[PDB]
Each structure stands twice: as C-alpha cells, then as structure tokens.
Design an enzyme around this catalytic site. Structure first.
Site, mmCIF file in Angstrom:
data_model
loop_
_atom_site.group_PDB
_atom_site.id
_atom_site.type_symbol
_atom_site.label_atom_id
_atom_site.label_comp_id
_atom_site.label_asym_id
_atom_site.label_seq_id
_atom_site.Cartn_x
_atom_site.Cartn_y
_atom_site.Cartn_z
ATOM 1 N N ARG A 27 1.131 -1.388 0.563
ATOM 2 C CA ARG A 27 0.159 0.265 -0.452
ATOM 3 C C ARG A 27 0.514 1.591 -0.221
ATOM 4 N NH1 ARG A 27 -6.089 0.037 1.030
ATOM 5 N NH2 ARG A 27 -6.432 -2.737 0.846
ATOM 6 N N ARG A 31 -4.496 6.096 1.078
ATOM 7 C CA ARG A 31 -5.174 7.207 1.858
ATOM 8 C C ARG A 31 -3.815 8.028 2.558
ATOM 9 N NH1 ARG A 31 -8.718 8.716 3.834
ATOM 10 N NH2 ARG A 31 -8.863 6.910 5.647
ATOM 11 N N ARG A 40 -8.094 10.447 -5.925
ATOM 12 C CA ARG A 40 -9.285 9.632 -5.296
ATOM 13 C C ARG A 40 -10.626 10.168 -5.872
ATOM 14 N NH1 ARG A 40 -11.707 6.875 -5.202
ATOM 15 N NH2 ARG A 40 -11.656 5.719 -3.670
ATOM 16 N N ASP A 76 -6.796 -3.114 -6.643
ATOM 17 C CA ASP A 76 -7.707 -3.827 -6.343
ATOM 18 C C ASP A 76 -7.715 -5.646 -6.098
ATOM 19 O OD1 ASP A 76 -9.346 -2.727 -3.526
ATOM 20 O OD2 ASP A 76 -9.256 -4.541 -3.702
ATOM 21 N N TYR A 154 -14.307 -13.577 0.199
ATOM 22 C CA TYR A 154 -13.992 -11.792 -0.291
ATOM 23 C C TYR A 154 -15.844 -12.301 -1.163
ATOM 24 C CZ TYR A 154 -10.988 -8.754 1.470
ATOM 25 O OH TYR A 154 -9.367 -8.222 2.448
#
Lengths: 356, 356
Positions: A27, A31, A40, A76, A154
């Site tokens: 990552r 963020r 974003r 992702d 998921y």
C-alpha cells in the site's frame, strides 16, 4: 520498454547478492498520502482503477516522495471477482463490499467463464504499460492479484470478516463447490497475471491475506494446491509466449504454519507478516528462497529514531542475503509519510552499514 | 462445597494420566443453544451477568445436553474494565461496546483504583459459589478473565478490531501510559481471580484473545510480563490465604510465536488455536505443560461423521498424555448443538479406543 536502471529488487528476488537491501511498502500508494486522497476524490474506487492515467499517477506518487526500490501497480484485489461478474459497491468510507455475496452452490452460475476475465481487465494491462513507460526504467514494476482462497473469502463473506465463518462453512459443508470456485478463480488469475507481465510487469505478488483463518489441514486442501497451480501455470504460459518469467512473491498473512510448504510452492520470494521472527522464518524456508518483510506497520507510529532502531534489529535478524525489506502488512491510512520515509532511509542506510 | 466426583479435567491439567481425554468447549454457554437465547431475552447482556441465578443457569445448560468434563462460569471478559469504571452498551445485536474508549493518557484518571475492583465484582463470586453448589461435584468449575493486553485492546479500541491499530499505536507512541494501564489491569485481575477461587472456582483460564496482533517483540514487552505476573501473584495470594492453588490455563489466540515462552510463564496448561499443528505445539512447549485445544470451531459445520474423523486425527496428533480437548476458539452462535455433542462424544470414544 526503457532499460531498467535500478534492478536491486529483482536481483534480491532471484537470490543474488546486492550492495544494499531493496525496500518497498505494501500500500505505498494509499490514503496515508494526501495527494492519493486528492486524486481519488475526483471519481470513486473502482472507477479510478478503470483510468490508466489515474492508476499510473497513484503508482508514481510514492516514488516522488521516497527512493523506493520498486513500484507496485495501483489496483485492487477485488477487480478479479468483479471481472468475474460480481457487483462491487465500495461506499461512503466503508471499504470492500459485495452487496450480493455468493451463498449457495447455485450462485456459481452468476460468474463469467474464467477464460474471458483477462479481456475484462484490459484497463489494468493499459495502466501497467503506461506506468512501465512513465517510470522509464527507474525501478521495477510489480503486478499483483489476490490468491484464490483470499478472493473466495471476499466473494462469500461479502467483504471483510473476523472469523471467515461463512467461507470456512463452505469448505466444511460444500467442499466440491468450494474446489469448483477455487479452480474458477485459479483459471481467471493465471491469464490475468500473464497479461500483467505481457503489459510490462517485472515481478508478481500473490496476496493470500486471509491465510491465517485456516489451520494447516484446511490450508493444504483448499489454499496451497491453488497457490502452487498459479505459479506453475503462469510460468508455463510465459515460457511458451517467448517471454522471460518474472520473480513471483507469495504473501500469506498469518501463515506461520505454512511457511515450509510455501517455500516449496514455486515462488522466488515468500513474504511474511510481523508475527514470525525473521530467524525462525529463515529456519522454516531454508536457503533456497528470498524472504520479504516484515516490519509491523504500526511500528511507524513510533518516532523516526525508534523506527531506525526497529529496522536495524530487523535487518540484523534477516541478514544481508536473500532478503527484500517491506512491512508485514499494508500501510494504514493514518500514518505519517515522513515516518514512511524514515523506514525507507533506515533500510538503505543500515543495510549498507551492515555490509561494512 | 460438595466433593468433586469427576476430576478427569483437573488430573489432566496437572499432568497426570487419565482413563480418557477430558473435554470442554469455550463458549459452551452461548447463543448456539436455544435455551441460552431464551433466558438471555429476559434482561440485557451485563444485567444477566449481575444475577447469580441467571449466570448459574446459563453455566449449567450445556451440562444438561452434553457430558462435558468441566463447566466454565458464564460471564464476560468485559466485566473487569466495566468494574474499573468504563461504561458498556452491548446494544441491538452488535456485541462488545465501549462508547467512550480510552484515547489519551488523561483517560486513565477515569478508572477506579484496581484494589476496589473485586468488591465491584461480588455478583460474579456469588454466581460462582451458587454454581459450585448446584453442580454438586459433578465436574470442576472453571473461573476466567481476559488477559491484561486483551482487556487493554477492548478499552482503547472500544470493541472488536481487525488491526488493533489504536491499541498498538498506544504501545508505540505511549509506552509509559500503556505499561500503567497494563499494571492497573494486572492489579485488578489478581484479586478478581483469587476471589473466583475463594468463591469456589476449581481452575482458572486467562484469555489472551488478541495476542496475535502483536509480534514477538511487542508481546514480550507488553503482554508476557503481565501474563507471568498474574499467575505468580494469584498463586502467592492463594497460598497465603491457606487455600489450594488451582490449575491455571493461558490461552493465547494466534500466539504461535509465544508458545515457548508461554510454557515458561507459570501456567499448568497452554491453550491453543487451530492454526498450530499439535505435534509442533508439543515441540514448542516441551513435556512440562498440559496442552488444551484445538479443533477449528468451524469444523463443527461438517457432518457428525466428519467431526468424528477430525477428532480422531486431532487426538492421534496430541497423544494421550498432558492433553485437554477443546476447540481452538469459542463456539459460533450458528452452530448445531447436535454437532457439539458429536464432538464431545468423539473425544471420549476415540481417546478410550486410543488407550486400547
């Protein structure tokens, strides 16, 4: 493609001696970077993934801040189940979400044939080609995907879970349907990963994030075989296409119990979480594979000086051979970019000093 | 108190040979039982905890269904931080919740002096005495509490968490305040656990549920010392009170990295999650401690026949010595009571057969 200038990461990955330890962060495009949030805010999660220029930009951002020894494409893991036909609704600051998870065997009929997934993921390949061009050989570019078991969690859970109770219920109550789902995922992943390399990825990481919810026995039946299949098939396909195979990384978060097997699964590199002592990880894997990791990402909340010391100890434990520095998990969104830079700088500075 | 009739669990706990493997289940009193939901629907979570008769009833319920070799008092680990002065709001099917978590060092002033906690938890002692009387020596009664690190995660996070990022941020950014909090928790836990024994508990389990979020280094600084302190001090206090010490269990979920140390921490028994192979757990702990566990609770979703086989394999791996059968984590609320009974029966039946 431009000639790669700094290939330290690749050399370390293949097991070769290097002048310093290469480092990158899971990552690193995330963020925690203000500029990440900014670019974003112009779209939404999976819409950004669909713009080659936007994904390229997010990929490059951390490289402008820190002398990282590799870039990893921004994407992702959930793009694969989405390409398989599952609807995603990443919604007002809540993260991964399938509003209609798979819950029974019949739900498998909803999914595309895995052979068409690569064509659905053309935008990713475009972002990879573009990024490889724009990086202009500065450092290698890593492609990635989620491992089949992790993608299955998921798809069945609908998102994150503390127990994977529903997903593990499939393994125990619906073993045939589970194997079917896992094979579909494998068969989608292989052409997708080959495609990333064809588009210009120079290494590949398979992210088995939800490994640790399984014990040894479940993992060996339902996770390991597919992990082995992915490497074998990607390598085969690449050879036949006349292409050079790339270093492949298997990262199994909370997978202490499987390290021995994972060193035999066909991957150049085994990535570790912070819960395994480096020296014990080296015992488990042997001298045949490179290790990657494993700083507790939360360690970056500490002072810059403390980060330096924690890095020194970590490198002392891994030793200079067959090692890529990374965190044990992705960077958290409340982390300080200056502390990320402190981690990169301490890895480079100490690894050189350790070699002296 | 009535003379204990079946003490298999205690004998196994002290390391003595037994005629069969004793078995109990974490959360054997839990929502998977219809009668549990029923007698809980009459109050609310921490209000039930406050009624000795209600806690006794919940404790006994599973013993009427299954020939379990021990009862564990019904309570919650969160009763300690609550007794310390934190407000709980277990609300419309969402679970553990502190609406006002600890977030800065100043918040420590909100807490009671740990020396008064035992007097706040009088209702628990009453439930233990009552249950010990009502069980009438059928099987031993286990008392329990959460370990200091685990209770700290709850107090700081406000409830459950996937990363313990806030709690680990305290460890890295506020190490002095963290040690203070952990000592307060230790100092509250010791008189509480002694009190449970004084009220009639015949064994004690310390639940370090959030162990695995820490790596070896953080665990050794912030979790282990307090785990060692609790056993040492409880044992000392009990001796001085003229009482017999009871077997103590440390359960560290996801604590593979700490097993070696945990075998040296002053506990008769080390409880394991399902991610450690029994044979490897035995290597780590040596021949000096009893092991407890470790069936994947999700394994109970499988058929009764399959449960039988999974139990046979598990017992084969642990062997008949120094072993208490249990799951690797608490029973989930969607599990079938008939499958719980299948697990209890298979442990008894196979362990006898294995001895033949």
């Amino acid at each position: 493609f431009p000639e790669l200038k700094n290939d330290t990461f690749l050399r370390a990955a293949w097991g070769e001696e290097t002048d310093y330890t290469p480092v990158w962060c899971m990552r690193q495009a995330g963020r925690y970077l203000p500029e990440f949030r900014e670019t974003r805010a112009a779209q939404d999660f999976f819409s950004t993934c669909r713009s080659p220029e936007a994904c390229c930009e997010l990929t490059l951002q951390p490289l402008r801040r820190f002398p990282l020894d590799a870039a990893i494409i921004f994407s992702d893991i959930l793009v694969v189940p989405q390409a398989l036909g599952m609807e995603v609704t990443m919604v007002p600051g809540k993260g991964p979400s399938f509003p209609e998870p798979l819950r029974e065997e019949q739900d498998l009929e909803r999914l595309r044939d895995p052979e068409v997934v690569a064509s659905e993921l053309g935008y990713v390949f475009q972002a990879i080609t573009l990024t490889r061009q724009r990086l202009a050989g500065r450092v290698p570019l890593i492609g990635f995907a989620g491992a089949p078991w992790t993608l299955m969690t998921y798809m069945v859970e609908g998102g994150g879970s503390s127990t994977m109770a529903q997903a593990k219920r499939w393994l125990y109550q619906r073993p045939q349907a589970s194997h079917q789902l896992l094979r579909i995922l494998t068969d989608a992943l292989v052409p997708y990963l080959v495609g990333q390399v064809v588009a210009g990825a120079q290494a590949l990481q398979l992210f088995e994030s939800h490994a640790g919810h399984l014990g040894p026995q479940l993992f060996n039946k339902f996770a390991l075989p597919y992990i082995r299949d992915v490497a074998k098939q990607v390598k085969a396909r690449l050879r036949e296409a006349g292409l050079a195979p790339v270093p492949m990384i298997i990262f199994a978060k909370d997978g202490h119990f499987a390290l021995e097997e994972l060193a035999q699964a066909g991957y150049e590199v085994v990535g570790l979480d912070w819960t395994v002592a480096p020296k014990k990880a080296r015992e488990c894997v042997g001298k045949t594979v490179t290790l990657q990791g494993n700083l507790d990402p939360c360690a970056l909340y500490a002072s810059e000086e403390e980060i330096g010391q924690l890095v020194k100890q970590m490198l002392d434990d891994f030793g200079p051979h067959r090692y890529i520095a990374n965190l044990g998990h992705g960077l958290y969104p409340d982390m300080d970019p200056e502390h990320v830079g402190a981690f990169v700088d301490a890895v480079h500075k100490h690894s050189r000093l350790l070699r002296q």
